[PDB]
A = this chain, B = another copy of it.
């Protein structure tokens, strides 16, 4: 369809512009303030210390950031490539989340990562779609036990459908969105919004990598990080099905 295609494309283009302009209005003043803040501290350390060069001060500013990206001294002797984070990094590939919090450096690892991605993602894509309704229909199966008693006095079976369909969406969005946010606030000390901001960026596989729920499982997290990707696997599989079940319902 020549008309329907361009009607959406132009709608997307205007949507891309409008999103950027709102993003510009929300982030530009915070950036300008931070740069002038760096502009102020740059002066006083050059003022108080004439022996320090204007460049030598800047080389430090780089070496502080350019080295510790990516590490901080405001993470006790943890390795960036232990069996856990490597297992995390592998999952970020096939899930296409790709946090990028840990960066590849070896060229040999980059080549293997390419072929790891080309084979892995379709392999996970089947499993994710596989478990999707495999878990989904298994959970809509349990809905039926309710619908039995939920069908007596003045109860229409036609409405029993929607009183379990939205409920299936409810407790699923409850178990896989509200619950992890309530957990991540009490495990990673993120704010109530920062947890929702993480889960949404995680489940949408945008994977900004600014927030990561599995940097390092303390020293007594019994299965926290294992529970993290377990939340990712079942969380993606569930919400992928929700994004498609609503996709066929939207075919109007």
Residue of B with least CB distance to A103:
B210
A97 to B99, CA, bound (A): 10
Whether A30 contacts B124 by the Cβ 8 Å rule is no
Chain A, 1-46, CB within 8 A of any chain B CB:
1, 4-5, 8-9, 11-12, 15-17, 19-24, 26-35, 37-39, 41, 44-45
Does A156 sit within 8 A of B, measured CB to CB? no
A63 to B121, CA, bound (A): 37
Residue of B with least CB distance to A18:
B90
Does A213 sit within 8 A of B, measured CB to CB? no
Which residue of the partner chain, among B74, B79, B118, contacts A204 with CB atoms under 8 Å? B118
Which residue of the partner chain, among B89, B131, B208, contacts A5 with CB atoms under 8 Å? B131
Interface residues on A, range: 35 or more
The interface stretch among A105-113, A141-149, A161-169, A217-225 is A105-113
Whether B67 contacts A21 by the Cβ 8 Å rule is no
Per-residue CB contact flags for chain A residues 191-205 toward chain B (1 = under 8 Å, else 0) read: 101101100110011
Per-residue CB contact flags for chain A residues 61-98 toward chain B (1 = under 8 Å, else 0) read: 11111111111111101011111001101111110111
Whether A87 contacts B37 by the Cβ 8 Å rule is no
* Best-buried of A26, A63, A123 by chain B (most CB within 10 Å): A26
A126 to B7, CA, bound (A): 12
